[PDB]
PDB file of C-alpha atoms and ligand atoms in Angstrom:
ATOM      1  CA  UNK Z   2      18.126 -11.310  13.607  1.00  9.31           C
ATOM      2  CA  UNK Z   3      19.165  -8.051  11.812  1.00 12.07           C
ATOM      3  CA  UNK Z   4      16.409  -5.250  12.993  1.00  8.08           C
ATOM      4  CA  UNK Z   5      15.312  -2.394  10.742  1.00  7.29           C
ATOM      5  CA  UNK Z   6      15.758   1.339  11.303  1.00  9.26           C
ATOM      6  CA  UNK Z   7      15.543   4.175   8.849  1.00 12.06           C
ATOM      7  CA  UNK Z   8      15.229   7.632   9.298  1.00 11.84           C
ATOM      8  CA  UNK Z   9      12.084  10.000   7.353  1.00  6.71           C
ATOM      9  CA  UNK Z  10      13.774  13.326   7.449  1.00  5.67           C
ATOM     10  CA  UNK Z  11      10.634  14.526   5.174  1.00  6.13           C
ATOM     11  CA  UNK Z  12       8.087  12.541   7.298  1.00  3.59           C
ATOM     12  CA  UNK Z  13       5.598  10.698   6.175  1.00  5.25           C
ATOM     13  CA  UNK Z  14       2.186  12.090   4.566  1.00  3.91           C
ATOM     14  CA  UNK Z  15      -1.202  10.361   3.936  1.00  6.87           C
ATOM     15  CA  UNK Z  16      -0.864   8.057   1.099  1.00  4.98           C
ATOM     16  CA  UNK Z  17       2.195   6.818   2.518  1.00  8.72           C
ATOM     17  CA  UNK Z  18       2.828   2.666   2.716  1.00 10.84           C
ATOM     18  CA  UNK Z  19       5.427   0.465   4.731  1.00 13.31           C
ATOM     19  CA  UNK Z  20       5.637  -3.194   3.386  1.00 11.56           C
ATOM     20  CA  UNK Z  21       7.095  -5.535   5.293  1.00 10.80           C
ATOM     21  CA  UNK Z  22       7.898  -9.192   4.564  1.00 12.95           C
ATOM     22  CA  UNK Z  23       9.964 -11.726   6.416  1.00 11.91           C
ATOM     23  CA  UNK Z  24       9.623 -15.000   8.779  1.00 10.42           C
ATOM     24  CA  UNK Z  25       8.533 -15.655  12.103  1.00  6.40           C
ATOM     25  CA  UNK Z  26      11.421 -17.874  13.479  1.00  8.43           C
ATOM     26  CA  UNK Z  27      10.480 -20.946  14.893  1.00 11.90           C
ATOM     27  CA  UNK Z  28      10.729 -19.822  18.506  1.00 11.15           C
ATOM     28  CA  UNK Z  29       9.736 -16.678  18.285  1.00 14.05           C
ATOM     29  CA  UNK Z  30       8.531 -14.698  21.450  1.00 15.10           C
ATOM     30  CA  UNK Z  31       7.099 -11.349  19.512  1.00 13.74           C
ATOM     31  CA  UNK Z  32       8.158  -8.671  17.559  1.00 11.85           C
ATOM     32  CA  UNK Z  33       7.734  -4.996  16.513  1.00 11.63           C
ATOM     33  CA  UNK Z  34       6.983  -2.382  14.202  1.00 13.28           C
ATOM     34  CA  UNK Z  35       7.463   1.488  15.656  1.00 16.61           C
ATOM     35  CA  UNK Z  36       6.821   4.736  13.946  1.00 17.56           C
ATOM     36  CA  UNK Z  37       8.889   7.095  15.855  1.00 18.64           C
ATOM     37  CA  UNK Z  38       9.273  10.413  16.362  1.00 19.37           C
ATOM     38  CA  UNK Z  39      12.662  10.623  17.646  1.00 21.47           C
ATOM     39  CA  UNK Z  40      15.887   9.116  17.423  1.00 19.72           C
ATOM     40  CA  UNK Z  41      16.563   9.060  21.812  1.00 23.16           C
ATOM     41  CA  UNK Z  42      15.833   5.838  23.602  1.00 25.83           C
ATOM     42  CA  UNK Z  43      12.033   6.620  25.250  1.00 26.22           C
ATOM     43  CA  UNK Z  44      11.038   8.516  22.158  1.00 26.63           C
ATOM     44  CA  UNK Z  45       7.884   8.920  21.692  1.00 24.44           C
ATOM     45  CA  UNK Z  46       6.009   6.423  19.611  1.00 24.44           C
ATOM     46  CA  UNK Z  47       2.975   7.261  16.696  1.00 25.05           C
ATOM     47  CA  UNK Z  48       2.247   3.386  16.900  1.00 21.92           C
ATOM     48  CA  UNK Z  49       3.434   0.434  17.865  1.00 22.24           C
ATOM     49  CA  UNK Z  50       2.618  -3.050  16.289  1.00 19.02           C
ATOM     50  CA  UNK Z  51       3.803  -5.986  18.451  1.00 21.07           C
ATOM     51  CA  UNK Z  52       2.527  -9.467  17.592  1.00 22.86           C
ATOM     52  CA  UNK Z  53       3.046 -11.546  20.543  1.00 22.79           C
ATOM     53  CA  UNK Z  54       3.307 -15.124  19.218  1.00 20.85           C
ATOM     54  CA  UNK Z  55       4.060 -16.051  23.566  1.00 20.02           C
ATOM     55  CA  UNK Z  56       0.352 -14.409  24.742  1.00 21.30           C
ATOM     56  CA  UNK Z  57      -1.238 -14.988  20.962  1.00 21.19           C
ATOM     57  CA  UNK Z  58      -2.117 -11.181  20.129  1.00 22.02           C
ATOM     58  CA  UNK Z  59      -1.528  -8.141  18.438  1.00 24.40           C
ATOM     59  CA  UNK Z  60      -1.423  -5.224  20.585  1.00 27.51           C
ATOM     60  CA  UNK Z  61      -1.337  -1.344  18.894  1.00 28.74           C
ATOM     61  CA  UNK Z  62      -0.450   1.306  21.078  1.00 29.65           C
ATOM     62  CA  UNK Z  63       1.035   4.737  21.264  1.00 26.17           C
ATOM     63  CA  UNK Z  64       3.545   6.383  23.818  1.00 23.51           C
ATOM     64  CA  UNK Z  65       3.762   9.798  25.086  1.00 26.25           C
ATOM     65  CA  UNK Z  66       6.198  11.415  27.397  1.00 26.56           C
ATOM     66  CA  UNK Z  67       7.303   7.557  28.521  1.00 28.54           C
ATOM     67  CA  UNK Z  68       3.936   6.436  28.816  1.00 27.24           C
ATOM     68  CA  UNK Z  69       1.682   4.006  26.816  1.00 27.58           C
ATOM     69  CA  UNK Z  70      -1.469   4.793  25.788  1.00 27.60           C
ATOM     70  CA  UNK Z  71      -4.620   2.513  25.534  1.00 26.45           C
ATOM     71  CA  UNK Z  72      -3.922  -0.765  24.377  1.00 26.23           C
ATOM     72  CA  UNK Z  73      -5.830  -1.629  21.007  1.00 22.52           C
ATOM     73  CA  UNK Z  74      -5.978  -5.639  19.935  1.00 23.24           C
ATOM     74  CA  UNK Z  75      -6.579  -6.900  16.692  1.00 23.60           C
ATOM     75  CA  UNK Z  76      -8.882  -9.782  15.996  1.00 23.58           C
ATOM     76  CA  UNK Z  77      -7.040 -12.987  16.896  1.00 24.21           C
ATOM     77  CA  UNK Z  78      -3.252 -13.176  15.408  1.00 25.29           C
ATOM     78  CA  UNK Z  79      -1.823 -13.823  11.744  1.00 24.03           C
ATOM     79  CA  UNK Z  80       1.186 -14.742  12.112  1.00 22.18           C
ATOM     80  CA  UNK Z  81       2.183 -18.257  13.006  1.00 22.93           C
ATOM     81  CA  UNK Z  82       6.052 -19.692  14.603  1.00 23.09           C
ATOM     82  CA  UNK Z  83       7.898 -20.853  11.208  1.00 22.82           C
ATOM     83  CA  UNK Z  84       5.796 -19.220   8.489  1.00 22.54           C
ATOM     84  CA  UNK Z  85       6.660 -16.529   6.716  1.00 24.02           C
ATOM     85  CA  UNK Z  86       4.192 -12.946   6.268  1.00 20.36           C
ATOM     86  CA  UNK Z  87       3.858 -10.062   4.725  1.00 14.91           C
ATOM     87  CA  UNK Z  88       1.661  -6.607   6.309  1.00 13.67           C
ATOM     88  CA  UNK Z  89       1.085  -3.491   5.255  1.00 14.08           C
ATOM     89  CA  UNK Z  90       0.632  -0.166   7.236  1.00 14.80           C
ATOM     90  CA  UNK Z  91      -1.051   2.285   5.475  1.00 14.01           C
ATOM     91  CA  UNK Z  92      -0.921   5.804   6.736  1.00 16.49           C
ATOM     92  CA  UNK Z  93      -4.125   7.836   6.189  1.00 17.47           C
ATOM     93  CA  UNK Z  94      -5.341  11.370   6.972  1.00 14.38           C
ATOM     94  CA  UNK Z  95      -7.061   9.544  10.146  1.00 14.26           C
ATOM     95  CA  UNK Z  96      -5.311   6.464  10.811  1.00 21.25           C
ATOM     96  CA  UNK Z  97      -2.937   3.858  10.568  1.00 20.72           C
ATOM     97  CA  UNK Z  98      -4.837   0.530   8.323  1.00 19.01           C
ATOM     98  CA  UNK Z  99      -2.659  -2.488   9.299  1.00 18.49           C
ATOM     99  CA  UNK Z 100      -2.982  -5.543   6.310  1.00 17.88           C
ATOM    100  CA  UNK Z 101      -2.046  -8.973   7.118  1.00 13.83           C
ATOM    101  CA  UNK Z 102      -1.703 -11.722   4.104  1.00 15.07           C
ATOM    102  CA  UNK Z 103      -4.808 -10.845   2.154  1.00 14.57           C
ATOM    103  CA  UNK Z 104      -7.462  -8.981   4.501  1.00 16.25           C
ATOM    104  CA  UNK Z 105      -7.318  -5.457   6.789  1.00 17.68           C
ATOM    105  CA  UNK Z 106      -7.031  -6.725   9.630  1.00 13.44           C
ATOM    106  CA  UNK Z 107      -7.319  -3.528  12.166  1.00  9.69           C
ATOM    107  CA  UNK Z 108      -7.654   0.314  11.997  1.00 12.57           C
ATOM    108  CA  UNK Z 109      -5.440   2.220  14.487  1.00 16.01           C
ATOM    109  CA  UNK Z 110      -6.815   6.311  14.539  1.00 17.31           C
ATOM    110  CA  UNK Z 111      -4.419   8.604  15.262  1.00 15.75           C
ATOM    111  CA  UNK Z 112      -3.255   9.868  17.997  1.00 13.13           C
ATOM    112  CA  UNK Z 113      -0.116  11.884  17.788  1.00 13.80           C
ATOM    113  CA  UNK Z 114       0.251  14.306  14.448  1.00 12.54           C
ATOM    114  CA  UNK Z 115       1.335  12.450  11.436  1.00 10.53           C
ATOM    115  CA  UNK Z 116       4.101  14.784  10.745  1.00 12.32           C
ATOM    116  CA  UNK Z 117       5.410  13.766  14.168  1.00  8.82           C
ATOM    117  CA  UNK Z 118       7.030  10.705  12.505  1.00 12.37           C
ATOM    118  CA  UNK Z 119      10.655  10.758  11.706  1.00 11.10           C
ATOM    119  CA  UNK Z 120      12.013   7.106  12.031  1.00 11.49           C
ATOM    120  CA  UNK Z 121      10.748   3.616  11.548  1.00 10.08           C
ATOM    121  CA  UNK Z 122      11.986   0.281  13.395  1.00  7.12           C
ATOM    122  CA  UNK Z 123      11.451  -3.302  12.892  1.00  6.59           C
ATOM    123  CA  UNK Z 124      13.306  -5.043  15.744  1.00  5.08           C
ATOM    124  CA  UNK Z 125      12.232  -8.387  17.944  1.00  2.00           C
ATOM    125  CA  UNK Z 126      12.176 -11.946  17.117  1.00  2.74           C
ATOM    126  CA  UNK Z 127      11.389 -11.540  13.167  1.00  6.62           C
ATOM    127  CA  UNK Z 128      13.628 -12.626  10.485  1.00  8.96           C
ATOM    128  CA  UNK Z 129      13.147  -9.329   7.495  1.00  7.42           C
ATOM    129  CA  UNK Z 130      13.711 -10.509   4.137  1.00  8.07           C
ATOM    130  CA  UNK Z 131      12.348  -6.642   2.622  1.00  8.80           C
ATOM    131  CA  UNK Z 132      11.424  -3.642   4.308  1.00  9.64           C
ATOM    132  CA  UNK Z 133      10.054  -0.529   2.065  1.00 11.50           C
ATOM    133  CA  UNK Z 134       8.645   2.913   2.144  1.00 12.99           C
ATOM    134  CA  UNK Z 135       6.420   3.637  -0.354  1.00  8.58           C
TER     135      UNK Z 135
ATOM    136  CA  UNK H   2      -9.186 -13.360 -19.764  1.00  6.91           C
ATOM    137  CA  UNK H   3     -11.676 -12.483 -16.547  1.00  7.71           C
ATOM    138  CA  UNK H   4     -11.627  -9.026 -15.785  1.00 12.11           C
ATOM    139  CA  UNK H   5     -12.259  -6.655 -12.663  1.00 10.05           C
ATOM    140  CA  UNK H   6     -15.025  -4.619 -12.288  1.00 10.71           C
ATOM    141  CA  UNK H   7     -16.104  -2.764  -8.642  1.00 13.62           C
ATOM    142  CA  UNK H   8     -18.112   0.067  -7.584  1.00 11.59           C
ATOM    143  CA  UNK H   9     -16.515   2.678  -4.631  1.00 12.79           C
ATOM    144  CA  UNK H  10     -19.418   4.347  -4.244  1.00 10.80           C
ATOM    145  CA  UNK H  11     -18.133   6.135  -0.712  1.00 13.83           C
ATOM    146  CA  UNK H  12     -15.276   6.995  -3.131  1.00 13.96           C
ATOM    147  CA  UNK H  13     -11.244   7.363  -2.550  1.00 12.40           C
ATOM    148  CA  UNK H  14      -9.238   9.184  -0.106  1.00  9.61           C
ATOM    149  CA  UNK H  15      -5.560   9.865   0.411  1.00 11.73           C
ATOM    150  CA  UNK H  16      -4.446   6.076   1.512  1.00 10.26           C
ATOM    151  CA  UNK H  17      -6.751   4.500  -0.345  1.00 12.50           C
ATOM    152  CA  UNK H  18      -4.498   1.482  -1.702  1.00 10.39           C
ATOM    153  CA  UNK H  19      -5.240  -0.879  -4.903  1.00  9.04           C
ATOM    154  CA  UNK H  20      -3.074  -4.235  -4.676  1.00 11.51           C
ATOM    155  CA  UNK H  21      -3.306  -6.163  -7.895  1.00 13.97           C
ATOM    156  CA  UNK H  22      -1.252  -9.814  -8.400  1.00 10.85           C
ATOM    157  CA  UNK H  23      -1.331 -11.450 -11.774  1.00 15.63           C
ATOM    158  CA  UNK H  24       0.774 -13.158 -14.789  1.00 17.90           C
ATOM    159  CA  UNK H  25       0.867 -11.174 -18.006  1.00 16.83           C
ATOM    160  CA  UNK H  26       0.422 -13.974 -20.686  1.00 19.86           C
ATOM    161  CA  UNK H  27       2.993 -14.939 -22.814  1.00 19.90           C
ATOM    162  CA  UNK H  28       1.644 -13.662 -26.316  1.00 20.96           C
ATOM    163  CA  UNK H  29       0.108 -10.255 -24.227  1.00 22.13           C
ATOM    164  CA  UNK H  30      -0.068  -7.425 -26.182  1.00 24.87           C
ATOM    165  CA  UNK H  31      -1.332  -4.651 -23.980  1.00 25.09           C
ATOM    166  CA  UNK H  32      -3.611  -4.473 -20.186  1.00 25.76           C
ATOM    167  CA  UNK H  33      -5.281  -1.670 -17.876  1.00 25.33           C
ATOM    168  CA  UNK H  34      -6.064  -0.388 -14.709  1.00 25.49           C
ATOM    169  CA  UNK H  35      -8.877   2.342 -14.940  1.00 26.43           C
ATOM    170  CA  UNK H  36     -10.000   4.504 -11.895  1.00 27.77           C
ATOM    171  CA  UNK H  37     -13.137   5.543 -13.514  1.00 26.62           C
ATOM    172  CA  UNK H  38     -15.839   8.326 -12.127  1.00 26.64           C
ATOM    173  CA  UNK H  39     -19.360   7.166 -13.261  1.00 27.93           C
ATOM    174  CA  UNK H  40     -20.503   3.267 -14.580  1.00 26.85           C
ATOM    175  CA  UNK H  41     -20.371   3.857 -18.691  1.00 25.90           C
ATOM    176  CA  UNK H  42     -17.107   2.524 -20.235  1.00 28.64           C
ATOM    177  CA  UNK H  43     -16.640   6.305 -21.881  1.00 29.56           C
ATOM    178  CA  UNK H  44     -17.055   8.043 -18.327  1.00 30.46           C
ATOM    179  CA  UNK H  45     -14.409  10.188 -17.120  1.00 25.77           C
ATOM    180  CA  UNK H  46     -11.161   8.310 -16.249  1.00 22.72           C
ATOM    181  CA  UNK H  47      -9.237   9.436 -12.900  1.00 23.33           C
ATOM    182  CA  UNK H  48      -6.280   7.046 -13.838  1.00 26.53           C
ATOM    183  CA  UNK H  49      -5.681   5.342 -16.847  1.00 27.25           C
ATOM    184  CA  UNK H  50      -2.730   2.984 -16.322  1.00 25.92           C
ATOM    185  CA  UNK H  51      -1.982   1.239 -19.545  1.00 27.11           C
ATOM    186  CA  UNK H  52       1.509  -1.415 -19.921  1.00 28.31           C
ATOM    187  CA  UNK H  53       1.740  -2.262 -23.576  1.00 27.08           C
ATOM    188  CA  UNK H  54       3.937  -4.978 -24.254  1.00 30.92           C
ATOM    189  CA  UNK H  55       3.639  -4.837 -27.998  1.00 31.65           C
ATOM    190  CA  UNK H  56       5.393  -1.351 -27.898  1.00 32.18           C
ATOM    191  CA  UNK H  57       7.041  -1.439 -25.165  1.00 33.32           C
ATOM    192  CA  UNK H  58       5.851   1.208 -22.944  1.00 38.45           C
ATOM    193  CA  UNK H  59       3.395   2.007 -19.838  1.00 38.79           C
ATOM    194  CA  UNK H  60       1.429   4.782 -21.066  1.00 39.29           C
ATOM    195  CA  UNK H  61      -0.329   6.741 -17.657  1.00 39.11           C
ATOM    196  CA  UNK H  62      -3.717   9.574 -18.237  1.00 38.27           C
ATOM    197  CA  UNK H  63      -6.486  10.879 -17.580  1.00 36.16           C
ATOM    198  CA  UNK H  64     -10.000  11.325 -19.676  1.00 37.35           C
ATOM    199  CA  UNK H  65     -12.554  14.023 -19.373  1.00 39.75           C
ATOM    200  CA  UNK H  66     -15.628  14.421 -21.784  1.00 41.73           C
ATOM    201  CA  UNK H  67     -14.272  12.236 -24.037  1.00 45.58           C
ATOM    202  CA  UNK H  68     -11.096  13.804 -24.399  1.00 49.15           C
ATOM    203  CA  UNK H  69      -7.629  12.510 -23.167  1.00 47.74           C
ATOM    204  CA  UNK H  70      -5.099  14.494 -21.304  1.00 51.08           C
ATOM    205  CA  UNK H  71      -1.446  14.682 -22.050  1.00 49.50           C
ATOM    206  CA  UNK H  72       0.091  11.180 -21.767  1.00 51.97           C
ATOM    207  CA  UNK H  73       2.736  10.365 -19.210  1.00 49.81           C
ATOM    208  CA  UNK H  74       5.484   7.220 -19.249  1.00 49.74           C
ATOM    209  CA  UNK H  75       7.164   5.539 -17.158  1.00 49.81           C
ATOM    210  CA  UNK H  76      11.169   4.496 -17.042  1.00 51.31           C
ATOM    211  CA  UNK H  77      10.858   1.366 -18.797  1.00 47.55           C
ATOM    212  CA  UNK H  78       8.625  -1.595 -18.788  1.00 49.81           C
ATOM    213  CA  UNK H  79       8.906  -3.451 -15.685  1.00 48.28           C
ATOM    214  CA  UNK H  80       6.476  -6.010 -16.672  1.00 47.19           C
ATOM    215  CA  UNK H  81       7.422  -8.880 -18.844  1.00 51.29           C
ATOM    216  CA  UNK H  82       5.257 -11.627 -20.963  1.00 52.50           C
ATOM    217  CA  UNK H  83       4.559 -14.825 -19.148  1.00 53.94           C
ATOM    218  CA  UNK H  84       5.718 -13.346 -15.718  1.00 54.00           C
ATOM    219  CA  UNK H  85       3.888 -13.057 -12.762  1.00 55.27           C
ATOM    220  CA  UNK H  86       3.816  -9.389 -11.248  1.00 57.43           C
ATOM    221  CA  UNK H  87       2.059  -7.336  -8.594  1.00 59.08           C
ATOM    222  CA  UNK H  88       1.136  -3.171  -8.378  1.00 57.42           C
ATOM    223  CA  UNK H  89       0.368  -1.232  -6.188  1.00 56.00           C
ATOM    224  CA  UNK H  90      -1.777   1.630  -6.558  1.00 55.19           C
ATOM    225  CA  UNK H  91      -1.536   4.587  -3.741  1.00 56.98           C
ATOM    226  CA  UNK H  92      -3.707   7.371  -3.388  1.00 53.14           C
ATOM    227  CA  UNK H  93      -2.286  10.425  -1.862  1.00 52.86           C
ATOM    228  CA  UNK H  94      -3.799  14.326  -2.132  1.00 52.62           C
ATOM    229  CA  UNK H  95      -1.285  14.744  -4.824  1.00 51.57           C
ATOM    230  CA  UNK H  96      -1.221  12.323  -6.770  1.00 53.15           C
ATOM    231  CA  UNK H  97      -0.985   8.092  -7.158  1.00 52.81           C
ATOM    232  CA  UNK H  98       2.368   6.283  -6.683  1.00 51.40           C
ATOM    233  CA  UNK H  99       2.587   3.236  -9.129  1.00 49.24           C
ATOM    234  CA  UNK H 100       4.596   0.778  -7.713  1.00 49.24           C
ATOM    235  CA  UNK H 101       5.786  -2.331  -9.342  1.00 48.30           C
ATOM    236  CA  UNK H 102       7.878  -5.094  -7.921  1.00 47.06           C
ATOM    237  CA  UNK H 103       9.754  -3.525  -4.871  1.00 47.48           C
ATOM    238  CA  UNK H 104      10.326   0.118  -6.366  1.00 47.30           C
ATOM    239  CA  UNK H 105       8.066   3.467  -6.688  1.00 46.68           C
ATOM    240  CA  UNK H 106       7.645   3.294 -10.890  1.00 44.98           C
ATOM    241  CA  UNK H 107       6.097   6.750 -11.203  1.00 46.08           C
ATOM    242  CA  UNK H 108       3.862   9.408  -9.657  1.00 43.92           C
ATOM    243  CA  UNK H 109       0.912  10.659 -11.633  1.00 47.50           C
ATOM    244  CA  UNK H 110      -0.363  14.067 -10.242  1.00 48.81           C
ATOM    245  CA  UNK H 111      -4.561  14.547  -9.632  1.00 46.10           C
ATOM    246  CA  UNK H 112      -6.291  15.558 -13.016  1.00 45.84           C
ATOM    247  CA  UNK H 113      -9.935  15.040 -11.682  1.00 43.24           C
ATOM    248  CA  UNK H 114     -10.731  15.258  -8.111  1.00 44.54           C
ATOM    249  CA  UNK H 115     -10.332  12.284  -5.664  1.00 41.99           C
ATOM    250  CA  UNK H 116     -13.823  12.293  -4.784  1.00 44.75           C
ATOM    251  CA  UNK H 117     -15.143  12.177  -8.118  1.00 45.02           C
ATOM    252  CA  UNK H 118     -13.682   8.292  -8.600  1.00 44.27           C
ATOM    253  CA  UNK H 119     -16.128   5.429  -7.989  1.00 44.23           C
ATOM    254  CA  UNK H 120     -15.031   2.605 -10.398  1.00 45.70           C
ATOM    255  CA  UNK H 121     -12.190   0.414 -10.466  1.00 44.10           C
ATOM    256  CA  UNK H 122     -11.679  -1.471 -13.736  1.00 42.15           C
ATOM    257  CA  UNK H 123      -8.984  -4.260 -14.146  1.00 40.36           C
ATOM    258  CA  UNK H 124      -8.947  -5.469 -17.509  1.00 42.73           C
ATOM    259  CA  UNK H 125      -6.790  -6.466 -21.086  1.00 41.40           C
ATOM    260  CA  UNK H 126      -4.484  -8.990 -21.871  1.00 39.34           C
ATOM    261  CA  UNK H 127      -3.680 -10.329 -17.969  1.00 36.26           C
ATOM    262  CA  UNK H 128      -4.670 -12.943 -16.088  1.00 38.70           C
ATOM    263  CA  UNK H 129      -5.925 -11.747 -12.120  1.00 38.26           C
ATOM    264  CA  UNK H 130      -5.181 -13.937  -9.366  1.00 37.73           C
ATOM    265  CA  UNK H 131      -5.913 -10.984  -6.488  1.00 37.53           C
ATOM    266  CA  UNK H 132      -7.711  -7.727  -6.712  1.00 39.94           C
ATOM    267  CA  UNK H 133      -7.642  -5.962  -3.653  1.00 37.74           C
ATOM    268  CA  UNK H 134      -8.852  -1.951  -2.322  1.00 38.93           C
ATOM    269  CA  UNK H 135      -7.228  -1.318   1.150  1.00 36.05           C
TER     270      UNK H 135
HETATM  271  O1  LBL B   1      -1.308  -4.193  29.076  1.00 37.96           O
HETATM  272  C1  LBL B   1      -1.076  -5.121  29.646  1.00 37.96           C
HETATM  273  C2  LBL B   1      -0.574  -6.325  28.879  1.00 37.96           C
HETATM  274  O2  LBL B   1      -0.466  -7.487  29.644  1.00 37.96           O
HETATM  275  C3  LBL B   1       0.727  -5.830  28.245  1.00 37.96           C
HETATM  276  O3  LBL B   1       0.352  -5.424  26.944  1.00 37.96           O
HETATM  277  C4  LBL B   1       1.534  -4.588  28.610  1.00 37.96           C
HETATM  278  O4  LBL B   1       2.881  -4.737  28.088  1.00 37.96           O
HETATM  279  C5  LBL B   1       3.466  -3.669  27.405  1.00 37.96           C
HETATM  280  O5  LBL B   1       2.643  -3.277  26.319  1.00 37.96           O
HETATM  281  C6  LBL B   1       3.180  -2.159  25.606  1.00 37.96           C
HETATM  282  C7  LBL B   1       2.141  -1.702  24.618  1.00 37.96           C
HETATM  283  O6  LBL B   1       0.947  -1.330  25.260  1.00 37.96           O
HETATM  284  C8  LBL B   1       4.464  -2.574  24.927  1.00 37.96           C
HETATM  285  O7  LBL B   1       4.219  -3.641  24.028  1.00 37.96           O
HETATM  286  C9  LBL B   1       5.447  -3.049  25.986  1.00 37.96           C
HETATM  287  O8  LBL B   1       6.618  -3.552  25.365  1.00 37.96           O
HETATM  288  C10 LBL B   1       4.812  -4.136  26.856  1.00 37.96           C
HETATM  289  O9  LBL B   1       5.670  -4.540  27.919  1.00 37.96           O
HETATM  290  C11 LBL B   1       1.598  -4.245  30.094  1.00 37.96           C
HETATM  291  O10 LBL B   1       2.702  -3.390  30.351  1.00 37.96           O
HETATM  292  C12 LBL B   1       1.567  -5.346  31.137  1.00 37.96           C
HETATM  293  O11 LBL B   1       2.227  -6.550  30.791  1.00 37.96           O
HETATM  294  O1  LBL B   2       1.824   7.052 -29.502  1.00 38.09           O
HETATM  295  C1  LBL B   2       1.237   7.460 -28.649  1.00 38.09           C
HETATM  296  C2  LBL B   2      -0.241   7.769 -28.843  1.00 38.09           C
HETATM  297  O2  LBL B   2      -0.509   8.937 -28.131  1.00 38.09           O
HETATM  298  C3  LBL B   2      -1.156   6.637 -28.375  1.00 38.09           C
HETATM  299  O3  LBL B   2      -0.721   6.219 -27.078  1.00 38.09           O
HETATM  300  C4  LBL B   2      -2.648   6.925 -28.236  1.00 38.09           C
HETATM  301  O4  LBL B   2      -3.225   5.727 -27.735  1.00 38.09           O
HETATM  302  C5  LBL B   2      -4.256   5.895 -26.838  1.00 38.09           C
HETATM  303  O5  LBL B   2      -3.707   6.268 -25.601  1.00 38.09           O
HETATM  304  C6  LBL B   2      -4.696   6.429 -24.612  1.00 38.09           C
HETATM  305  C7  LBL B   2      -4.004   7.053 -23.427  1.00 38.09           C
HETATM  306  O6  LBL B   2      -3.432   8.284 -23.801  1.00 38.09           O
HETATM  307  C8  LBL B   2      -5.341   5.072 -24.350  1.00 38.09           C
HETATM  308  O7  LBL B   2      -4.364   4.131 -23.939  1.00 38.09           O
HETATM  309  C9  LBL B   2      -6.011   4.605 -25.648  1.00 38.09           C
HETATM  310  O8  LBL B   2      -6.616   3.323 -25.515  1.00 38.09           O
HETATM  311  C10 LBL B   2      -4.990   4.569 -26.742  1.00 38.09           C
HETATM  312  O9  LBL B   2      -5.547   4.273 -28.012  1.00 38.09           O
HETATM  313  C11 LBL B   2      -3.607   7.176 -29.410  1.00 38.09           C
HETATM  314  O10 LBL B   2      -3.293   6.536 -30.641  1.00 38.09           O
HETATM  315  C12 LBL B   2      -3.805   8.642 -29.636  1.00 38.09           C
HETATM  316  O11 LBL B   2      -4.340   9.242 -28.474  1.00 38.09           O
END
């Protein structure tokens, strides 16, 4: 599949929404969402959102200086092989509010600066049918 | 029609998101989404976000001690009768972003403070199928 990435010269501020909607293929390992703060392979990472259709999770995490932080996991996983989704990340002045389908569905605090975020990718096994920055 | 009616009695804060999905009817003449700050229908109104149909318009203010501020409109009307739609409302420390269908449709800048809102109203000539304050 086609992966996402677009550049946020001007950052992004609290009050500041990604949508993203598209379709789990059928044999679909996992997939991705980073907010980035650089455009070099390594760079570091504000969050990362990986639903892992193989181990059935969601893991959030940050990286720094090459290295992940602590793993965060969200309460069991909404997304299912062949159906299609939509989640929002909402960016706040303390955290990152992940929605899946109709309900939150976990909080990620900070912990890089906001206004470290230049980039955003959507990559992995997901087919994208819209990605936007509100 | 059934309308919405909900307290936020913590209040608002910059990321505070209000996801509404509904069909205008057919023969709809005009609908609203109020971000009130006290539980009278005359109490001061944050956001006042009013498409009219009948004249073709989406009018956008604010009300304080009775009196209303200077109206704002958006490009357009991107709502149509008998079509379903969906909004989103973002808070920010600036303002809200209205967005309708898959674009930003205008940015109304704070009249009253952000703290002072504790009602959401959903009401008028629409039909609700999903209210939602992320
Ligand atoms: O934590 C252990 C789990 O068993 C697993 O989550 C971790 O995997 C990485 O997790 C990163 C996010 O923390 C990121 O997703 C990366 O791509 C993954 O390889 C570990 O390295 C070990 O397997
Ligand atoms: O032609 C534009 C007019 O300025 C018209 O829009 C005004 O309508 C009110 O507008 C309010 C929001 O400003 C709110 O929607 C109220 O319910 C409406 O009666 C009123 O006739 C005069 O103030």
């Amino acid at each position: 599949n086609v992966p996402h990435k677009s550049s946020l010269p001007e950052g992004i501020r609290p009050g500041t929404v990604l949508r993203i909607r598209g379709l789990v293929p059928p044999n679909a390992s996992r997939f991705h969402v980073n907010l980035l703060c650089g455009e070099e392979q390594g760079s570091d990472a504000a969050l990362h959102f990986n639903p892992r259709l193989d181990t059935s999770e969601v893991v959030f995490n940050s990286k720094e200086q090459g290295s992940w932080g602590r793993e965060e996991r969200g309460p069991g996983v909404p997304f299912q092989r062949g159906q299609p989704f939509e989640v929002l990340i909402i960016a706040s002045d303390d955290g990152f509010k992940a929605v899946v389908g109709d309900a939150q569905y976990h909080h990620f605090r900070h912990r890089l600066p906001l206004a470290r975020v230049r980039l955003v990718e959507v990559g992995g096994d997901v087919q994208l049918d819209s990605v936007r920055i509100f």
